């Protein structure tokens, strides 16, 4: 329950972030969110985390590393 609702929380908290320090905060949090989106054994948390990746973060999702994570995401049990 903590994981679910707090992932939702951070997803909402990075709505306003975007200065350089804010850019670094966004980058670090997106890394920490993408790693949960892939590796967590629970399926529901993976689904929700991937669903929460709103369009507003596209400038960070176009980076190479995050693209590799997403391209790994295409092949899954669900």
């Amino acid at each position: 329950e903590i994981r679910m609702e707090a992932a939702r929380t951070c997803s909402r908290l990075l709505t306003p972030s975007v200065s350089q320090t804010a850019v670094q905060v966004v980058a670090d949090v997106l890394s920490k969110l993408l790693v949960v989106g892939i590796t967590d054994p629970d399926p529901d948390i993976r689904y929700c985390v991937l669903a929460s990746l709103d369009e507003r973060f596209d400038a960070h999702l176009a980076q190479a590393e995050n693209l590799q994570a997403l391209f790994v995401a295409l092949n899954d049990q669900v």
Binding site: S19, Q20, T21, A22, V23, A59, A62, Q63, A64
Partner: protein, 1044 residues
Amino acid sequence: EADLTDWNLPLAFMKKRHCEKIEGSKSLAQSWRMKDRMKTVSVALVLCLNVGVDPPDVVKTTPCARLECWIDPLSMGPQKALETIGANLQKQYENWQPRARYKQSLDPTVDEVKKLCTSLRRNAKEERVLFHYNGHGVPRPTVNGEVWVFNKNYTQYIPLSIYDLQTWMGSPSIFVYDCSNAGLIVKSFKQFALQREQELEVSMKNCIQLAACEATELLPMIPDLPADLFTSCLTTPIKIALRWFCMQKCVSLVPGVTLDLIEKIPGRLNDRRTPLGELNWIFTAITDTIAWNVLPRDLFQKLFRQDLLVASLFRNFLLAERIMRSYNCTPVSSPRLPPTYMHAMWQAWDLAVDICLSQLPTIIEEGTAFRHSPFFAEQLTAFQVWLTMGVENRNPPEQLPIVLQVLLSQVHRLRALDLLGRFLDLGPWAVSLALSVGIFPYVLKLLQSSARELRPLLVFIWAKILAVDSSCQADLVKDNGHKYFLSVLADPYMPAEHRTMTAFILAVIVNSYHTGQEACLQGNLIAICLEQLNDPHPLLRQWVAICLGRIWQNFDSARWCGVRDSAHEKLYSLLSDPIPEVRCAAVFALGTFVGNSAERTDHSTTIDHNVAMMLAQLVSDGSPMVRKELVVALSHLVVQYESNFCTVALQFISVYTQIWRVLLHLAADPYPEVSDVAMKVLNSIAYKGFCDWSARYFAQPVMKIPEEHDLESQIRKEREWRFLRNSRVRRQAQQVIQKGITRLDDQIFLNRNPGVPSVVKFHPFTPCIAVADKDSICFWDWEKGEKLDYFHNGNPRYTRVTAMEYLNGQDCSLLLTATDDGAIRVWKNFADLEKNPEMVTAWQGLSAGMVVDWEQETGLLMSSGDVRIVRIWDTDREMKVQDIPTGADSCVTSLSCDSHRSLIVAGLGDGSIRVYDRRMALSECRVMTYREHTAWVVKASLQKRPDGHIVSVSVNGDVRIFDPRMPESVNVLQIVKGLTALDIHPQADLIACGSVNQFTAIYNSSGELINNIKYAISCLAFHPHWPHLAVGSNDYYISVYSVE
């Protein structure tokens, strides 16, 4: 509070933070220096196959298409076959290296091979030689690598072993084995080479090898593919690649594509605009990309940079691996590479191929014009997207080998140059990467390009390269180069930023290369420099002066030319620039001018003498960079004037006497480094830098966003909270003032002083108790009373501290400590004194003790009073002093100024205070003589209130308040009788007088005195904002008195 408390008030030694960065930088690995230049010279074509002879090892089938070099004339008979195949191998190898020496041998035997190898060794011995074995139509090699020669008879066989070839082939060499079990040959070769090297102890490391497939497996037979699949892959990659592509795709998504169209593709394979040339262009880019991205550096350089032919063969070898994998064959090579056929980049290749073939119908068929591909545009887009965040603590871009070759065309070149420049904002990291990958010789060739629009980019690129690669030994200068940048700087219309960069480039060229110091004279750089002195741009003037100095260094003819055009006088006119950096540049250049005079004397010694005088006046300058560069330039002068100081030094122990005065004044300056260097120069004579910082500037990143423009920066929050603290402390003091003030009958502070509290001072915020003794400044925490550390001032035995002040009322001020001998020692590091007691600097204020008053909102500092005059220093520009000759007759006073006007008050002299407005002419200095104190005046000072009366104390104790406009209109109280001093607090109804006994006396503006406050007296000090009185008693304690 913080909205206004954060004033636009820079610190006087703020620029010290930049000025003291007298440092250099680091060099590079410079792996680009390909000292190994071993090229390949000649090639041997060993066509051992006998046409029409089927060895017993093989059993063919009907679809055994035995194409070799795409040509299968088993119909034509054996002789035509051998002739044609030899000719075609010749033609194919010429496509990759036309310049070699080609020798053919079709069905050799033994003495043919021995003679051929001997001739090859005679032709060359260090340059590599290529050799390859066909190796079809002969039995399979043995465990000894034996190879069957035939004596024009298949039964008459000779099995030549590896050892004979190793003996015959001793020089550096490349071997290619298109056998069935070629890996066996390679393995046996390495074993035999080990045995040979062991015998040499009673050639390895000079041998490259490529093998068709592993020892335990044979080449496949495919109905459609050539029999010489490995050779074709290493030799003609495009044709086999396209043909395999059309044959191998499981489901075709481009109908109409067929081998008939593939055999008719228009192009040349050497014209990037044509289809086939474009396809080579993409292929080369992709393969270099993979090779750079999977290998370490040294292997990459060895395989892909030393030699052209080796690089081409390995470039094709990667494709060979990809194609061979699908038919159960692993190619084998000398030093092995990691497995590469899973790399994502290969997908790009497939996509690109499709697009071209997707339009190959209706081009061949109808003649519709060919369209160009979007590959390089997309790669540039990806590189840009990586740049947009550009963090250097991660991987570098994967596309850098692609933009390297995008530079080589003439279509996207501007955009690639722009992106490379952005990549080279950036740090030494990006410079190192872009240098290691290559690039720079191509830019050196672009220097000779006729496109002038490429000028601003190239300059900037070079402006970074020489900034980091300062040790570059001017390969550009050899191919003109210096002349190109001379013509660049000759342009006046070019922006001042690019002119400054070109000036720096020319400076580095002259500095780092002697023939550069000649070429600057060949092109008349001195005249161009003297012309470019007429620009407000500071750095451009600095580099103009530095170029002039470096030109004059090590050439007497340059020095003569500088005399000829009166270069030194124009340089002397540069000394009127407020900026200390430009004046340091002028000082350096003049010192170098005199130093390179070579003691020719003639009439120019007078000029040299003048140059000495040209610097001597700058002893009046207080700027630290100027002082340090002055002592350096004086060393550059005395290197010659020591020829005649051998007599004149006895004066110190006309021109030479003034030089002694200059060096002694610089020795007498309180600043530690200047005094130490000046004493070293004085000792060196008597017994008988900024350039680095300026060059260091360019290598720094450009287009920096300040930390204070980031809204969430910690600096902004910390500054705001500090200024709120200070504002609220001042507001508490204002509340104390507004609520009403009683006699200071309460205590806040009481603590021991180790010595005399001669002077006492505080902040206009949380007032850390600063107290000066003769030779130290000791601190106490005010709110708690905790004693803190002290700064030892290094004062002489005959020197006390006579005053103290601060350089900011709101921010981290630097405490000034003014002493008897004219010195001022300065440091802000009283903040967190327990943690950072490192004091900052010192300088000369003077040239009644000494007193300093800083004009916070004007940038000036008024100084007194060992001199009879008033000394106004300016600290926000060229640090000079205005000398105001007042009418005082002796040491004057602690000065004060009512900031609303330029009103100054002065005097401890013959019975008058002298008050004048500086706006009047400073040669009369009309002063209001306040003669009511005919006795020896004491402590003339101003009220900062709107009323603005003149405060006065007698030596006899009379205390008087004059109307500023009427000396006759006065108020007299005469309170200091049996008391030691006076101190009014204009923001409060409080005036302290101390005592000669063990108590303290305070009185209100009406004169109402008390003499029984106890919590003689050397010092009295009201806090600048609190109505609280500090008493620096003569019992060596300090105490703060507070309102009840």
